[PDB]
């Protein structure tokens with residue numbers, strides 16, 4: 001999409017429609033005449049364009065109104081009112097831009113931000129951008145959260161996010177121009193290799209994959225057409241549904257072997273009854289011929305009954321020979337209708353031991369995508385965010401993804417090695433109790449108008465708490481926290497002293513021995529300039545490989561790589577790193593997933609702020625004080641960096657709306 | 667509206683595989699046994715029929731009679747008349763067979779015989795006698 005309409009698409013916004021959010025801020029415009037709406041919509045799209053074409057400088061209202069032409073620049077307040085809405089909700093002037101108007105000399109209101117993940121940083125940038133006092137408390141000794149980047153010599157490899165999922169409407173697109181991110185497109189080709197080390201043949205790879213995708217569509221049909229979404233009072237998972245689909249395909253292979261062999265009995269038995277008439281007929285013929293000889297032995301001249309006997313017997317044996325000729329003609333048709341069926345037998349099996357192994361690799365790929373065993377994903381909802389896929393190829397960040405947090409971090413008041421232990425929020429403000437990670441005895445107190453929580457969902461889930469809320473989170477929030485899923489995938493980073501793999505191949509598979517290890521070291525990435533292979537551990541494997549030493553793990557990696565390239569061509573790795581995200585106390589996992597029994601609506605619950613009760617009973621209903629951001633709070637873009645980032649922008653918008661007011665609604 | 671093609675998924679079959687924990691394995695063992703079952707009644711009738719086929723070796727070729735080619739004639743000789751009355755008694759109404767007994771007489775002449783020589787040869791009682799048998 002191009003022009004002004006491209007800017008609305010690149011901003012995840014319908015170019016020809018007002019959104020629910022814009023209705024809320026412009027209830028005049030949207031309930032008004034359709035002509036004003038097109039003006040507004042153009043003004044939005046035109047402003048978004050201006051920001052998008054150069055996102056390294058701030059877009060001021062003046063700069064904006066100047067480049068609008070009439071009739072659109074006829075109303076200054078409508079333009080001023082649009083530009084302000086955009087700037088507030090981080091659609092324009094977000095990320096890293098030089099300002100034109102330097103910052104307000106004094107700050108208004110104070111906000112504490114827990115965590116300096118991307119979602120933290122993104123709000124903090126914006127809140128500071130709005131003239132607020134922002135401090136981030138971060139438990140680690142580094143910014144970025146689950147954007148981890150290993151660095152040592154020239155070796156660079158991310159342990160966390162590594163893929164930008166396509167720049168078509170991705171906010172990271174804008175951030176990529178703001179920061180020098182080296183974005184290298186992947187190449188989609190992924191050669192599979194089984195446990196022996198032989199490459200899987202092209203015909204088998206294509207066959208299995210198509211069945212894989214056909215099995216996914218089948219589960220979708222079970223879900224939306226057969227309403228197969230509860231099983232014994234429990235939600236059906238995706239994994240269950242795949243079994244139920246595979247079973248019904250193995251059923252149908254047998255249902256149809258039976259029906260085919262049942263065609264051979266039904267015809268071998270027509271033949272049996274016909275050989276029975278033919279053996280009996282060759283006996284009525286054997287004696288009736290005998291009888292005709294005897295009659296013909298009587299020598300002439302004969303009386304006429306003796307002559308009629310020969311003629312009658314001769315006629316009868318001829319009639320009886322017509323019959324046996326017709327019958328050995330049918331007998332010839334059914335003996336061929338039996339060889340045709342014999343040489344046209346249907347498929348013996350649904351999938352062999354070997355095919356079901358290659359299919360397990362494609363299931364490990366789903367397990368990696370959603371960082372969880374398929375037995376936990378909701379059948380109904382696990383892909384509820386598919387409609388908002390970006391367009392374009394996926395990319396990698398070839399100088400390390402950490403370069404983005406670190407960039408966003410610059411200019412901000414960040415207390416590292418500060419672990420929040422208690423959050424207290426009252427009708428009159430908030431206090432956050434944090435401690436020093438290095439020495440727990442040192443204790444810190446932060447007072448503020450608002451706390452923005454971006455604690456990972458695995459942290460929020462932790463029993464007994466790592467962070468205590470005072471007063472406790474209402475049941476409607478804690479139940480969303482329990483219902484949601486927080487998955488796990490891990491990475492092994494192998495640093496070598498030479499490329500020994502296909503350099504024109506970014507990624508290549510390794511087929512598991514068993515279903516249970518389908519996730520154990522199933523995929524390898526060749527993503528970086530240097531010689532670094534990087535090996536995933538998905539599914540049920542992810543949680544178990546965390547109990548195994550680094551050397552036992554790098555051993556299996558070396559084994560696998562030997563089998564595919566031979567023992568001579570694979571050296572020891574110079575440097576090795578193995579992640580353990582579920583073990584990490586500041587993550588407790590990798591990202592979130594729509595658990596069975598959950599839904600995308602739980603993501604909306606995670607995003608609602610908390611409003612404390614009144615201090616003085618009978619006092620006026622207070623302000624909201626505790627706000628949540630992060631990957632698990634954004635319904636349409638969960639478990640991503642861009643979703644983290646967008647959720648920060650979102651909270652910064654509504655915290656600002658709350659504590660600085662919003663003139664753009666008049 | 668409809669599944670991917672070749673996928674088999676009706677409301678009846680899903681319930682029968684979910685009804686309990688191994689309700690899957692049961693009904694796919696019901697079918698492995700219903701197919702061993704059929705593949706050896708296959709092999710047993712394929713063997714019964716191999717034996718019936720051994721008895722028909724040689725067909726009926728010793729048992730043939732050559733084809734008599736003889737030009738059809740009009741006049742009824744007394745010998746031909748006598749054969750017909752006996753053919754009528756041994757059959758009755760099967761003009762094709764009678765035509766084949768007499769050999770030089772077509773099926774229309776036989777039917778015409780039935781009424782021309784009806785009195786003199788008392789063809790009436792003859793058929794009564796045949797029907798008793």
Ligand SMILES: COC(=O)c1cccc([C@@H]2C[C@@H](O)N3c4cc(C)c(C)cc4N(C[C@H](O)[C@H](O)[C@H](O)COP(=O)(O)OP(=O)(O)OC[C@H]4O[C@@H](n5cnc6c(N)ncnc65)[C@H](O)[C@@H]4O)C4=NC(=O)NC(=O)[C@@]423)c1
Pocket residue numbers: 114115116117118119120137138139140143144145146147159160161162163164165369370371418419420421454455456459466467489490491581585586587589590591629630631632638639640641642644
């Ligand atoms: C349906 O779609 C898909 O499934 C999907 C689609 C496309 C790509 C991807 C992938 C898969 C993978 O390949 N990659 C990835 C890999 C790993 C290993 C991991 C682990 C993650 C990813 N993420 C996710 C992304 O990493 C994160 O979702 C994002 O980073 C969230 O950030 P956050 O919400 O801000 O949260 P935080 O945890 O970062 O920060 C919070 C801060 O709180 C601090 N604190 C804790 N406790 C305290 C305390 N007590 N006090 C003070 N501070 C505390 C803590 O220290 C931390 O710093 C991926 N996303 C991608 O887009 N690309 C990828 O590449 C992908 C998946």
